[PDB]
Each structure stands twice: as C-alpha cells, then as structure tokens.
C-alpha cells in the first residue's frame, strides 16, 4: 500500500522534473520545512544529494523538545524538590529525549539519579494510567509539543475532568508552529517556499496556514512524510515560485482536511489559550505558546507550587549553534562540536538530544 509514495520510479521522475524546472532557474531557491519528521525523511532518504545545486532544503524549528525553554525545565525540577520537602512525592513523566535535555542546572535524568521518580512515557495516556495506579501520589507530565502533541493532551484532559481526577497534572510547554514561522519571516530567515508540516496540518488543516501565504505571499505546501511526498512538494514549490504563484497546495490530502480536525481544535480550545512564549535559543515569540485556561488551572502543576527560577540561565552551552540550526541558517556540520564533543550519546546541545533534532538526524544518518 502507498507503494507509489516510495517507488524508485515515481521518485526518479519527480527528481527529473525538479532538475528540469531548476536548470533554467536564476539565483537560488530556498525551501524551508518546520517538522523534524520531514528533516528525517529528507536526510534518511538522501534527498539532498538528488537536488540541483541551486535548490536548497533547510530545516526550521520543527522540534518541540529542542525549543522548550530551560527556565521551564528547571522550574519543573525545582517543583519536584519543593514537593519532596513538603513530604509530597511527585511522579514525573516525560518523553525519552526530553528526559535527557540539558540545562545549566542538569536534566530530568540527573534528577532521576537523585532519587526522584522520573518516568519516561511514549504518550500522555501512559501518564493518565500512572495516575490511576498511584492515587497516593501526584503524577505530572512535563508536556512539550506542537499541535499534533497538544491534541492528545487536550483529549486526555477531557477524559480526566469527567473522571474528576485530582492527581492528573501537567506542566504545559506547548507551542504553535504557524506563529514561529511568521517570526522567522519578520527576522530575515531566507526561503522562497514553505513545506508545511504534515501532522500539525492534519490538526489545524490547510486553513491554519492560509493566514501566512496571504499576509506574506509565501507559497506553502502541506506534505506527507514518504520520500515522494517531499520530492513532490519541492517540485510543486519550485513551480509556484517560477510562476509567481502564492497559494497553498495540500499534497497530503489523503491525511489532511481543509478544515483539519475539528474535534481536536475545540478539544484543545476547551483547555488551552494562545499566549506569548519563549522558544529556547530563539527568543520570545508572540502568541506562539499554549497555557491552561483559568478554569482548567487545577490541571497545571504550577497552580500548586510557585518556584523561583534563577535569572540569566544561558539557553545553550558555549560553542553550540543549535539556535542557528533551528532557524535554518546553519547546518549542524557548521558546528565545531558536531560529532566531536557533541553526539547523541553525549549531547552538548538540545538539537542533538531530540529525536526530531536536526543535529541528531544529521549525525544519525551520515550526511554527505
């Protein structure tokens, strides 16, 4: 099934069309995607080695774990300690890569080693289950992620209110993709085409990305994650650039609805509200984050603990260029630490730690 989407023929055809449309192209065309899964597709399938010298694919900040502020990671840790001293022991769930994310003050794993109960989970439901198995304890899930990950949390929060669970809390560090994309525009990040993230689209649909192509005239293209989805999108983008088009094509129509996914949208709306948030190594982006509304405030772990997070916490270690990698302005290989002191096993920056981290992906796949 979907064999075509991986067909060596379908691919070599798309690659030929792309080469054709570009041999006549002046200057250079830069296409940016904002999804780590797309970066994985591009890199895993060696798509860059199939592109013409004048066509470039750059990875934007498509990694929710990479951009979660250190201030928030430290906060969660401070609250674990604050609870301990208050006799209360908390059960903290986090994703695997987030678990190892470094900060000036250590990671969740460093905490684990101090005798704290930190558990790695694959989803929020895992956390929900732990909540029912441990009533004598407050289970909290450090929740980072974009729309695609926000939804499962917005749904789990519903199933939790009905059940009237009191030990089901989460530290919201959710972010919105479209906003950050605009910010990069207002800041000079160069690219003439945008490969909109497949899954985040599935949620906010093609509709969620329109406000961008209209307010800046940038041709967007919702794409899947098979190698031919991305090759298609690139071709489609090269052409809307050459023909001066400025619209949004839904190449991933098989999985995305124009309106997207209504349930999730309201499901998320029922609990979260767009707010101003900080993106690690990038700055404070306007209306780019999601925090729990005043009502569902009892689900936020911070409504039970107020900690003093030290100021001036550096976002990255000296020498790390993850901030530029996140902007699609730098390649991980440009980094002096890349593959040296920084590797997936012993990461210096967040971009190398994260599964959707561009550095980890480049490292993992031996980029040419």
């Amino acid at each position: 099934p979907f064999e075509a989407y991986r067909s060596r023929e379908v691919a070599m055809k798309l690659v030929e069309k792309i080469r054709e449309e570009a041999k006549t192209l002046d200057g250079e065309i830069r296409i940016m995607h904002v999804c780590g899964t797309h970066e994985d597709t591009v890199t895993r399938h060696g798509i860059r080695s199939l592109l013409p010298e004048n066509v470039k694919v750059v990875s934007g900040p498509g990694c929710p774990v990479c951009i979660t502020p250190v201030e928030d990671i430290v906060a969660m840790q401070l609250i674990m300690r604050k609870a301990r001293e208050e006799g209360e022991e908390i059960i903290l769930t986090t994703f695997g890569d987030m678990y190892k994310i470094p900060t000036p003050m250590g990671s969740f794993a460093d905490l684990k080693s101090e005798g704290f109960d930190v558990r790695i989970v694959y989803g929020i439901f895992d956390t929900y289950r732990i909540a029912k198995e441990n009533p004598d304890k407050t289970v909290v899930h450090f929740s980072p992620g974009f729309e695609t990950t926000t939804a499962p949390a917005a749904g789990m929060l519903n199933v939790a209110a009905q059940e009237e669970l009191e030990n089901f809390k989460i530290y919201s560090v959710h972010r919105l993709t479209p906003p950050a994309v605009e910010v990069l525009l207002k800041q000079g990040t160069v690219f003439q085409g945008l490969i909109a993230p497949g899954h985040v689209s599935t949620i906010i649909g093609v509709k969620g990305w329109e406000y961008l192509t209209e307010k800046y005239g940038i041709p967007q293209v919702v794409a899947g994650f098979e190698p031919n989805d991305v090759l298609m999108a690139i071709l489609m983008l090269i052409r809307m650039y050459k023909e001066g088009e400025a619209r949004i094509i839904n190449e991933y129509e098989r999985a995305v609805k124009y309106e997207g996914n209504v349930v999730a949208q309201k499901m998320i709306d029922k609990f979260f509200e767009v707010v101003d948030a900080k993106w690690r190594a990038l700055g404070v982006f306007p209306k780019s984050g999601l925090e729990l509304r005043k009502e569902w405030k009892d689900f936020e772990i911070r409504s039970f603990y107020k900690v003093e997070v030290p100021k001036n916490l550096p976002d990255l270690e000296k020498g790390c260029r993850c901030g530029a990698v996140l902007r699609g302005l730098a390649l991980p290989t440009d980094c002096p630490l890349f593959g040296k002191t920084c590797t997936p096993r012993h990461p210096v920056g967040p971009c190398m730690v994260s599964y959707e981290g561009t550095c980890q992906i480049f490292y993992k796949y031996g980029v040419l």
Partner: protein, 52 residues
C-alpha cells in the same frame, strides 16, 4: 515518528491497530468515527486522522 496502521478492532475510545504484523492499542478520542478496516495516523498513542 508517526506511522500508518490498519484498524482491526474498536471499543469506544480504544482501538487495535496493526502496523504490519505489529499491533498496538490506540485512543480514538480524536477520531470517534474510526471503525475496523480504517487506516489511521497514530501519534503518541492517539489516532489523529484516517486515510482516504
């Protein structure tokens, strides 16, 4: 890392998806209309969309 799977069982919110000889349970909270035979996109244990 989201991957496609064929639904082979539904039970209200829970579902059993087969990803080529590998089955796993998935919450249908975001795809209520899901039903056996369908093909959904699973992200962190949740169905987020069906395929056409």
């Amino acid at each position: 890392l989201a991957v496609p799977g064929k639904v082979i069982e539904v039970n209200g919110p829970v579902a059993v998806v087969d990803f080529g000889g590998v089955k796993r349970e998935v919450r249908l909270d975001l795809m209520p209309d899901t039903k056996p035979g369908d093909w959904v996109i699973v992200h962190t244990g949740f169905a987020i969309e069906k395929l056409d």
